Amino acid sequence: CSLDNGDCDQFCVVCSCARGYTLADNGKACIPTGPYPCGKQTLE
Amino acid sequence: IVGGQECKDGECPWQALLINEENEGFCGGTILSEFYILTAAHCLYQAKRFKVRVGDRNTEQEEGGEAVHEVEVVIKHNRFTKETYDFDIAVLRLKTPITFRMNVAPACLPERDWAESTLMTQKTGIVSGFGRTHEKGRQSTRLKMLEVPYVDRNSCKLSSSFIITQNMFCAGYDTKQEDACQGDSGGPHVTRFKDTYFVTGIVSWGEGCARKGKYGIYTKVTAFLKWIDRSMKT
Ligand SMILES: CS(=O)(=O)N1C[C@H](C(=O)Nc2ccc(Cl)c(F)c2)[C@@H](C(=O)Nc2ccc(-n3ccccc3=O)cc2F)C1
Ligand SMILES: [Ca+2]
Ligand code: NA
């Protein structure tokens, strides 16, 4: 977890994500489940 | 906010504004979910009755996306006191759920150990709000944001007239004229990790605003992640 956050997109090798996110196939990236996921700036 | 800049469309969607009986903003909040707003305990003392406005970027103009919510339940930390300003945290449950849209979306809550090790050790965070633009001046009618560096705890304690507790952290600038101010209190301090913003602080207090040799003091949200979780489950 020390080096590059364990390559994790969010929480840390065992990665995980915040509510409203699913951990990706690669087991590192996080995929949002809804149009307005937490902690993302909104676009039109 | 002293210094900083107006938030661009969608840039600060987790911002909430507590409005008093005179329909005037007096404190900020952070959207945590469709039902919960995070704010400072000390804000609750400033208005007998208040509502929450989301989606507003300019308090002088009604623009699309603004909505008003009544508060159903106020959950103030039982250890907050004005003597020390320690435990300066509250959660508001709203009567009706917020509809997420452009300019209206929650900030992420992090996990405690990860946040302590990875978020808080970042260089900077972002503070936002509609508070005073100068210490002795008027509140901003436009939503402003400001990047504020994390400041070393010991440096901050040396600078402060008051005790800095483990439930607080410091951020901002020694002498540069940029800081949060009164009226921003209760609002969000967020830290970006990669492309996600996580709530790391609640705008709490400071001696004046943007004073040379003083910093802004924030409630350290990591200290209260269990408390928040318990508050949001009732
Ligand atoms: C001059 S002003 O414009 O009228 N205004 C600006 C100050 C401010 O809040 N600035 C501010 C600046 C930066 C940030 Cl981040 C932030 F939230 C706020 C506010 C103040 O003096 N606050 C203050 C000062 C001290 C304690 N405190 C702390 C510990 C123990 C006891 C104790 O009373 C509590 C306080 F509310 C007065
Ligand atoms: Ca408006
Ligand atoms: Na300062």
Side-chain angles (χ1 to χ4, degrees):
Chain A
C1 275
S2 305
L3 190 68
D4 303 304
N5 185 47
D7 301 275
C8 301
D9 239 53
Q10 291 185 8
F11 309 137
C12 190
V13 168
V14 193
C15 303
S16 57
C17 317
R19 188 194 175 187
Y21 290 83
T22 312
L23 180 63
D25 291 313
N26 58 72
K28 293 175 181 180
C30 295
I31 330 290
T33 67
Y36 296 98
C38 80
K40 294 294 186 198
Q41 284 163 324
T42 61
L43 311 82
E44 268 184 10
Chain B
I1 301 289
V2 189
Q5 324 169 298
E6 297 190 27
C7 290
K8 290 175 188 73
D9 224 21
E11 236 198 327
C12 308
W14 33 80
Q15 179 78 46
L17 180 63
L18 310 181
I19 53 174
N20 66 14
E21 291 187 46
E22 295 144 341
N23 309 281
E24 184 179 18
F26 65 96
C27 271
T30 306
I31 303 172
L32 299 185
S33 70
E34 68 177 352
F35 277 110
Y36 292 96
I37 303 301
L38 184 69
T39 193
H42 81 257
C43 286
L44 306 172
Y45 297 62
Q46 294 171 203
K48 203 167 184 178
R49 282 186 284 183
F50 64 87
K51 319 284 195 184
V52 176
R53 191 191 292 151
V54 296
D56 196 5
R57 288 187 52 252
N58 181 338
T59 61
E60 266 186 16
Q61 288 292 326
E62 269 172 299
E63 292 179 66
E66 295 167 49
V68 179
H69 288 264
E70 276 171 7
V71 178
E72 193 188 73
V73 180
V74 177
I75 305 157
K76 176 183 63 155
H77 200 290
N78 292 318
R79 297 174 70 183
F80 177 76
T81 167
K82 273 182 286 178
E83 173 172 70
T84 57
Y85 265 64
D86 206 4
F87 303 93
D88 191 11
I89 189 168
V91 162
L92 308 177
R93 190 190 166 86
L94 299 179
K95 187 177 177 170
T96 58
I98 287 161
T99 301
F100 302 147
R101 55 205 181 256
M102 184 66 176
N103 284 318
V104 190
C108 300
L109 290 168
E111 278 182 337
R112 183 194 66 193
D113 304 334
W114 182 83
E116 288 285 75
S117 78
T118 307
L119 275 183
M120 306 296 294
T121 61
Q122 299 281 299
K123 189 173 184 293
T124 75
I126 304 295
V127 60
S128 57
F130 292 93
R132 297 182 186 209
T133 60
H134 297 286
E135 188 176 317
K136 302 139 176 185
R138 291 187 173 183
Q139 277 202 295
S140 182
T141 52
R142 310 287 190 99
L143 181 57
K144 286 173 74 182
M145 60 176 279
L146 173 67
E147 194 170 307
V148 286
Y150 284 98
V151 164
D152 171 78
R153 182 169 299 271
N154 302 290
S155 293
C156 188
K157 284 170 164 179
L158 286 180
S159 77
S160 182
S161 305
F162 303 98
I163 290 145
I164 307 308
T165 71
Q166 55 169 42
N167 301 313
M168 310 173 183
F169 69 91
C170 308
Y173 290 100
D174 187 354
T175 53
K176 187 181 187 200
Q177 292 299 294
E178 296 208 296
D179 196 17
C181 200
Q182 194 179 238
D184 298 314
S185 318
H189 177 286
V190 295
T191 302
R192 182 193 49 82
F193 187 74
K194 298 196 80 72
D195 256 340
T196 310
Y197 291 83
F198 285 93
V199 57
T200 37
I202 300 162
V203 181
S204 187
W205 59 275
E207 303 182 56
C209 299
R211 280 195 196 174
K212 159 174 181 179
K214 294 285 179 290
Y215 301 103
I217 324 286
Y218 297 81
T219 306
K220 183 200 290 182
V221 166
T222 62
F224 295 105
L225 291 169
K226 289 177 180 179
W227 182 88
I228 285 165
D229 286 322
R230 209 166 39 243
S231 300
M232 280 175 84
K233 289 171 180 171
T234 292

